[PDB]
Amino acid sequence: GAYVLDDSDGLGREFDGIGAVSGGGATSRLLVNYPEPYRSEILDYLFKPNFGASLHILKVEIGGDGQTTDGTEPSHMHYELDENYFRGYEWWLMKEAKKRNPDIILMGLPWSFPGWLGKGFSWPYVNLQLTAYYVVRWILGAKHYHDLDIDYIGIWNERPFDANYIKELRKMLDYQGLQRVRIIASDNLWEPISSSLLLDQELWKVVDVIGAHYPGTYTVWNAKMSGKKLWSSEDFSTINSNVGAGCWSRILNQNYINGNMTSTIAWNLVASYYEELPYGRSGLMTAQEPWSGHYVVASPIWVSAHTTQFTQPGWYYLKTVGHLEKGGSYVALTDGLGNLTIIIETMSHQHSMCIRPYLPYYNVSHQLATFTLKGSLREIQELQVWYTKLGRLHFKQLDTLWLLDGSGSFTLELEEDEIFTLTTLTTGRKGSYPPPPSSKPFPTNYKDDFNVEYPLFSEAPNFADQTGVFEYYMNNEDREHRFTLRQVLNQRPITWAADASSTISVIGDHHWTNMTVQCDVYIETPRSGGVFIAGRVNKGGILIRSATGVFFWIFANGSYRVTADLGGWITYASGHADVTAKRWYTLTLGIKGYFAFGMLNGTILWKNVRVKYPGHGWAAIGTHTFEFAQFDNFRVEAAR
């Protein structure tokens, strides 16, 4: 009926910020090649203060060369003795975020690791000092090459922690002058990290934040007892429809109310990956068409604004937060400087389901709520008002509220699926850019000759690696193939996902069904080496081992094979071919209806081979195992 807001008995917990994840894996892949001004506009909707999502926190994957949900991300150390701090796109992203908001909080976390760290095993805890050296290199590089201060470092995403590793990581950080870097653990469930902190004083000292994933707004007794900051260090992961926006709205409030969690971080930041990859369109907004420039400022962007534009890390929650009599919730925060922000949501069960976990039904119905400002809040006469209605009206500023009658009280009519932000702050703004170009399919005629002498990014645009890692490569000693694309992994990573046994990068339009793919290929490994080109590739990401399609393989022992699957269990055709290592060949693969054909150097190798139909999927290139190979003059023409 009447809800009292008051700071007289003191304050709740310190608010640490709202953020999002870029990574786990290759979620920002297609953002980098957006033409201006659209690329920069997207970044503004995400990071510019008092504009759009105005994020307080950016968490990135520390690429480990393994598949990590929608692709692989390149490591700074592919091999022992290798160091390169300019691969991939996380450095660029962190810098773009920092330019817009210098006070943004930066976090890094590994999902996979390069295989060499395992010293023979697929395990990162074989040599604790070596693994810690690898991670700390990344942090130092962020500073030395990009002027980035990494604020938080994690352990091993959704995988076991080793208490001794965590201790060694703290030692190593301090030893390299990174005492300011804080450690969050263990990016999994509340246990066993929470109980481990109670049983081990030395571990307790080195862990600054307990970060749990998909907690369903709740925590556990051992975590409260630890006295540590508690973050939902990964949450959301729901399609950015109105339903997704409701889920985000509800957990933003209730993670603190129900679970004492003072930060929530959404996976993922922006859906810049092919939608038919796992968890498609599960970012705060959508930018999956760099070829057209089309992007969508999705609902969760404005849901974010309701908190992020009106709070900052370092504000405090009030003791006075809770649930509404007839459903929904309210939180309230101050800055200690007389400001006050009040965030109210009334998300109905049917329009706010997250994918993890699914909540049993709860009722929400029309209600009236009366708020009274006791303590030092009483001295406030006036509030700005922001309003959103999901279903749709977004981040609409309403008429200022006045409490001049000395009552220190006000009342609201609340329906379902609504958010209200009531704040003293005047700085609010629904940021706006002109609409971007209409959506368009991937170009039905496409080519890349990779002839770029000084590329801005380490890989050609639109190629999304799903196992292995592909990079621009310059070979001066050859004039006919001076600039190519090269697969650079020579051993399987310490994997997070189930990476394929063959490397593969996909590109184009998953809807494609009739297509002709061509590429010059070059096998580097004598006797045992092999490469392929492919069409109708129907799965990737964490499901990359499941991929079917039409795969045209050639091998350095003078053979070829046509398969239905990436795993090569199912044969469409096979035979001999004049193919050896260290020689350039042109491969052509044509697929139409029930039939396919393959060419070697313009000459037919196999023809009218029956394949499964109907079928559809991307084009692709790859290598038989984790082995060096080069590709050049890529072409695809397709019909959707």
Ligand X SMILES: *[C@@H]1O[C@H](CO)[C@@H](O[C@@H]2O[C@H](CO)[C@@H](O)[C@H](O)[C@H]2NC(C)=O)[C@H](O)[C@H]1NC(C)=O
| Active centre residues (catalytic) | 158, 234
Q: How many residues bind Ca ion (CB under 5 A)?
A: 5
Q: Burial level of 135, CB count in 10 A (0-12/13-18/19+)? A: buried
Q: Any contact of residue 158 with ligand X (CB under 6 A)?
A: no
Q: Any contact of residue 335 with Ca ion (CB under 5 A)?
A: no
- What's the gap between Cα 265 and its chain centre? 11
Q: Which of residues 313-332 bind ligand X (CB under 6 A)?
A: none
Q: Any contact of residue 451 with Ca ion (CB under 5 A)?
A: yes
Smallest separation, CB 25 to ligand GAL (Å): 6
Q: Which of residues 529-568 bind ligand GAL (CB under 6 A)?
A: none
Q: CA-CA distances (angstroms) from residue 614 to 249, 397, 550, 593, 595?
A: 41, 51, 12, 7, 11
Q: Any contact of residue 158 with ligand GAL (CB under 6 A)?
A: yes
Residues 6+ apart with CB under 8 A from 550: 534, 535, 536, 562, 563, 564, 572, 589, 591, 596, 611
CA-to-CA distance for 156 and 395, rounded, in angstroms? Answer: 37
Q: Any contact of residue 449 with Ca ion (CB under 5 A)?
A: yes
CA-to-CA distance for 488 and 76, rounded, in angstroms? Answer: 12
| Number of residue whose CB is nearest ligand GAL | 24
CA-to-CA distance for 89 and 26, rounded, in angstroms? Answer: 9
| Number of residue whose CB is nearest ligand X | 593
3-state secondary structure 182-206: EEEEEEECCCCHHHHHHHCHHHHHH
Smallest separation, CB 357 to ligand NAG (Å): 21
569 in a labelled binding site: no
- Closest by alpha carbon to 364, among 290, 414, 412, 409? 414
CA-to-CA distance for 63 and 73, rounded, in angstroms? Answer: 5
170 in a labelled binding site: no
Measured from the CB atom, the residue of 110 and 327 that comes closer to ligand X is 327
111 in a labelled binding site: yes
CA-to-CA distance for 307 and 417, rounded, in angstroms? Answer: 16
Smallest separation, CB 614 to ligand X (Å): 8
- Give the number of residues written for the chain: 640
Q: Any contact of residue 558 with ligand X (CB under 6 A)?
A: no
Which single residue is written with the structure tokens 């990068």? Answer: 505
Smallest separation, CB 182 to Ca ion (Å): 45
Q: What is the DSSP letter of 441?
A: P
Measured from the CB atom, the residue of 349 and 430 that comes closer to ligand NAG is 349
Question: Which listed option, ligand X, ligand GAL, Ca ion, none, makes contact with residue 267 (CB within 5 to 8 Å by class)?
Answer: ligand GAL
Discontinuities after residues in the chain (C–N over 2.5 A): 391
Question: Which listed option, ligand GAL, ligand X, Ca ion, none, makes contact with residue 279 (CB within 5 to 8 Å by class)?
Answer: ligand GAL
Q: Any contact of residue 584 with Ca ion (CB under 5 A)?
A: no
Q: For binding to ligand NAG (CB under 6 A), which residues are involved?
A: 363, 365
482 in a labelled binding site: no
Please count the CA atoms within 13 angstroms of the CA of 236 that sit on its side-chain side.
35
Residue 10, by phi and psi: left (phi above 0), alpha (psi -120 to 50) or beta?
left
Question: Which listed option, Ca ion, ligand NAG, ligand X, none, makes contact with residue 374 (CB within 5 to 8 Å by class)?
Answer: none
Measured from the CB atom, the residue of 160 and 593 that comes closer to ligand X is 593
Q: How many residues bind ligand X (CB under 6 A)?
A: 16
Q: What angle do CA 306, 309, 314 make, to 5 degrees?
A: 110
From candidates 291, 371, 450, 470, binder to Ca ion by CB under 5 A: 450
Q: Any contact of residue 156 with ligand GAL (CB under 6 A)?
A: no
- Closest by alpha carbon to 170, among 141, 122, 129? 129
Q: Any contact of residue 272 with ligand GAL (CB under 6 A)?
A: no
Q: Which of residues 614-633 bind Ca ion (CB under 5 A)?
A: 632
Measured from the CB atom, the residue of 112 and 348 that comes closer to ligand NAG is 348
Measured from the CB atom, the residue of 21 and 596 that comes closer to ligand X is 596
Question: Which listed option, ligand NAG, ligand GAL, Ca ion, none, makes contact with residue 24 (CB within 5 to 8 Å by class)?
Answer: ligand GAL
Q: Any contact of residue 249 with ligand X (CB under 6 A)?
A: no
Measured from the CB atom, the residue of 361 and 569 that comes closer to ligand NAG is 361
Smallest separation, CB 252 to ligand NAG (Å): 24
Question: Which listed option, Ca ion, ligand X, ligand GAL, none, makes contact with residue 281 (CB within 5 to 8 Å by class)?
Answer: none
Q: Any contact of residue 608 with ligand X (CB under 6 A)?
A: no
Q: Any contact of residue 637 with ligand X (CB under 6 A)?
A: no
Measured from the CB atom, the residue of 235 and 416 that comes closer to ligand NAG is 416
CA-to-CA distance for 216 and 569, rounded, in angstroms? Answer: 41
CB atoms under 10 Å from CB of 174, counted, come to 12
The answer to whether the bond into 614 is cis (omega within 30° of 0) is yes
Q: Burial level of 200, CB count in 10 A (0-12/13-18/19+)? A: middle
Q: Which of residues 15-44 bind ligand GAL (CB under 6 A)?
A: 24
Q: Which of residues 212-231 bind ligand X (CB under 6 A)?
A: 224
Cβ proximity of 207 and 183 under 8 Å: yes
Question: Which listed option, Ca ion, ligand X, ligand GAL, none, makes contact with residue 483 (CB within 5 to 8 Å by class)?
Answer: Ca ion
Residue 380 is encoded by which pair of tokens? 């406030």
Q: What is the DSSP letter of 464?
A: E
Q: Any contact of residue 378 with ligand X (CB under 6 A)?
A: no
Q: What is the DSSP string of 226-293?
A: HT-EEEEEEEE-S-TTHHHHHHHHHHHHHHHHHH---EEEEE-S-B-S-TTSTTTT-SSSEEEETTTT
Q: Any contact of residue 196 with ligand GAL (CB under 6 A)?
A: no
Smallest separation, CB 157 to ligand GAL (Å): 5
Q: What angle do CA 401, 402, 403 make, to 5 degrees?
A: 125
Q: Any contact of residue 381 with ligand X (CB under 6 A)?
A: no
Q: Any contact of residue 339 with ligand X (CB under 6 A)?
A: yes
From candidates 22, 28, 54, 157, binder to ligand GAL by CB under 6 A: 157
Residues 6+ apart with CB under 8 A from 160: 186, 188
Q: Any contact of residue 279 with ligand GAL (CB under 6 A)?
A: yes
CA-to-CA distance for 25 and 20, rounded, in angstroms? Answer: 13
Residues binding ligand X (CB under 6 A): 224, 257-258, 260, 335, 337-339, 424, 513-514, 592-594, 639-640
Residues binding ligand GAL (CB under 6 A): 24, 68-69, 157-158, 234, 237, 267, 279
Residues binding Ca ion (CB under 5 A): 449-451, 483, 632
Q: Which residues are annotated as a binding site?
A: 69, 111, 157, 356
